[PDB]
């Protein structure tokens, strides 16, 4: 029963935390697994996303080898402070932490051949520069870059343990706005003046779901634009009715745009939704100005030509505008 | 391979943990290098911007002159904690930190001659001077100021290591609503009450992209103003139509002004 005790005691004794495994030898290859517990949020305004995961590192160390114990030794987490571990870090993180309830969420497992499994529960806010020109019809690529701080490729290498099955849990992730179309794993070397450093990259391809915008942005805009055309069928002499309808359609269009601005993220540059909203705004504006032309031309100096042509042109031109928009932005 | 441990221990022993390099001699030429990962956010409300960088401090210290290996024996952990380092700090930062996952983002490289290179991945919430009288047509200078806290130019001096090449990664900066027109590096000596202190400064000239506001703010107002002028062509004896048009255009302008003011 105390055999494991003194076994671990001699294992830790004479252990040099300063030096990597095989300090004079070839570089030590560190395998990595990630289990995505959740992707808590994706912020377009901040251009980042939060990510909770079980991050596990595998590496073979001959100092931590034992015999006569046919069982994998899971040790108390504090032992991680006493052993050597890689200086891994996420190159594009803004803030990250290891969860600490009830104890520090960390695990060390030593295998008899010398393998070390080092697991952490990390929540990290990683940067995701986003191209939002096609918003809400956009498609983002959010990456997590894993790199070693001091050690270079002559001292370590990284690889995805299990190959393409190294990252799990991506299927169970559910986001309210995005769908994770694909995920990808890349392993490369990054050359600097200091030298070549190993790197792993975990990429996610997110497609923004558009069901919200169809019913909140596009259908209301289309319906107000259609209602603006009702004035073309109203009598030219019904100035009160036609002007009230046109100006109230303009007011309703302005309401929808303001509300969307307040509800949607800031993103201070031109997007697809802005172009569609301004197109609808210009259409209702021209519909109101059409009655200005009609009223001036007839009152000031059986259906009039202008309304008769407007009835054809405005639906027609709006159809072409929609066609061009949907082709260009899809 | 115990000899490297003994070398580190013996160079540690007898080393001035507190005294600066060459207390009786000239000041220490502490060079600075920066590799900006990315400027995060720019608050027109809080007057600040968050900046992520790899701050690198270079200096010479004859006391920490080891021997045996020429591959630049780089250290971390306990011995790396207690060797003397400059008291450099950022003057403008409201809040800052050094990243600490999976390990503390820090490194201290010792060259055989005695040179020390101190690298830190830092996130600083520096403060920026914004003259918003011309917003959204404005053009700001955002500066990060680096200064010594206790030591004057007699004890410590600062300079840019590599001239204009010291601060790399400017191209990496990719802010959505701002275009980085130019960057500049400045090195000066301020005069406080105690004496002449050194100072370095890294300035960015950000220019707002005036395409969003033209589309979604100026042109709606212009079109509503034209719609208000529409009433001058309607008949003089159409009181319902012209009054409704005028008062509803006023209502629409107030709506734009009130709701837009909630978004800026």
């Amino acid at each position: 029963m105390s055999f494991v005790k003194e076994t671990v005691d001699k294992l830790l004794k004479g252990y040099d935390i300063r030096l990597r495994p095989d300090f004079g030898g070839p570089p030590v290859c560190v395998g990595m697994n990630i289990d995505i517990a959740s992707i808590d949020m994706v912020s377009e305004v901040n251009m980042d996303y939060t990510l909770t995961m079980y991050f596990q590192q595998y590496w073979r160390d001959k100092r931590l080898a034992y015999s006569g114990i046919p069982l994998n030794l899971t040790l108390d987490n504090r032992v991680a402070d006493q052993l050597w571990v890689p200086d891994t870090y996420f190159l594009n993180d803004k803030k990250s932490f290891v969860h600490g309830v009830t104890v520090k969420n960390r695990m060390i497992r030593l295998h008899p051949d010398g393998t070390v499994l080092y697991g952490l529960r990390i929540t990290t806010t990683a940067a995701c520069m986003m191209d939002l020109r096609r918003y809400p019809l956009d498609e983002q690529n959010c990456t997590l870059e894993i790199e070693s701080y001091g050690y270079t490729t002559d001292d370590i290498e990284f690889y995805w343990r299990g190959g393409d099955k190294a990252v799990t849990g991506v299927e169970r992730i559910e986001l309210p706005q995005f769908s994770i179309v694909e995920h990808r794993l890349v392993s490369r070397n990054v050359v600097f003046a200091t030298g070549a450093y190993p790197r792993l990259s975990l990429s996610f391809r997110l497609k923004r779901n558009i069901g919200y915008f169809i019913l909140q942005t596009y259908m209301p805009s289309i319906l107000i634009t259609i209602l603006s055309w009702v004035s073309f069928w109203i009598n030219y002499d019904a100035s009160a009715a036609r002007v009230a309808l046109g100006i109230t359609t303009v007011l309703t269009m302005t309401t929808i745009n303001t509300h969307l601005r307040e509800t949607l993220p800031k993103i201070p540059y031109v997007k697809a939704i802005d172009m569609y909203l301004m197109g609808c705004f210009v259409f209702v504006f021209l519909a109101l100005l059409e009655y200005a032309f009609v009223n001036y031309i007839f009152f000031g100096r059986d259906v009039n030509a202008i309304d008769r042509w407007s009835r054809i042109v405005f639906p027609f031109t709006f159809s072409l505008f929609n066609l061009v928009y949907w082709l260009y932005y899809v | 391979m115990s000899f490297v441990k003994e070398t580190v221990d013996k160079l540690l022993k007898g080393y001035d943990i507190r005294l600066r390099p060459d207390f009786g001699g000239p000041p220490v030429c502490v060079g600075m290098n920066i590799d900006i990962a990315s400027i995060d956010m720019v608050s027109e409300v809080n007057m600040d911007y968050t900046l992520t960088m790899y701050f690198q401090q270079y200096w010479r210290d004859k006391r920490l002159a080891y021997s045996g290996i020429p591959l630049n024996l780089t250290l971390d952990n306990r011995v790396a904690d207690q060797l003397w380092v400059p008291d450099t700090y950022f003057l403008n930062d409201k809040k800052s930190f050094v990243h600490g996952v999976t390990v503390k983002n820090r490194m201290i490289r010792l060259h055989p001659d005695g040179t020390v290179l101190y690298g830190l991945r830092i996130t600083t919430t520096a403060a920026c001077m914004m003259d918003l009288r011309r917003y959204p047509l404005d053009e700001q200078n955002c500066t990060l100021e680096i200064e010594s806290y206790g030591y004057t130019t007699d004890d410590i001096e600062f300079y840019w290591r590599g001239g204009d090449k010291a601060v790399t990664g400017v191209e990496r900066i990719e802010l959505p609503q701002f275009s980085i027109v130019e960057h500049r590096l400045v090195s000066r000596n301020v005069v406080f009450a105690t004496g002449a202190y050194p100072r370095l400064s890294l300035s960015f000239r950000l220019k707002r992209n005036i395409g969003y506001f033209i589309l979604q703010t100026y042109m709606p107002s212009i079109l509503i103003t034209i719609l208000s002028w529409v009433s001058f062509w309607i008949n003089y004896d159409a009181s319902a139509a012209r009054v409704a048009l005028g008062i509803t255009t006023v209502l629409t302008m107030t709506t734009i002004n009130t709701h837009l003011r909630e978004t800026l």
Partner: nanobody
Amino acid sequence: GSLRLSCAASGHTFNYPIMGWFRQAPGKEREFVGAISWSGGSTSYADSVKDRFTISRDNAKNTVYLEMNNLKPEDTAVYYCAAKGRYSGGLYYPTNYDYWGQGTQVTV
């Protein structure tokens, strides 16, 4: 001799914002000439050719123009346009660049 080379990218160009202009002389390895970022500002040039060359960008049509005001006989080489990822690494080194153009040939 106001020469103007052009590099046109087709595909996921946002994923590779930096475009670097390189040149490889006969026999010699590939040299670094210049670089341009996504916004088109905050450019960079090599020390040797810092003033001779200029770089311009237009993302409306997604092209990069490289302008030479004065040419020299030693400039005879194959000019290459390369792309680089955001967190790829340092500018001056060729291995960090993923996608290479076939590169035009310039002789003077």
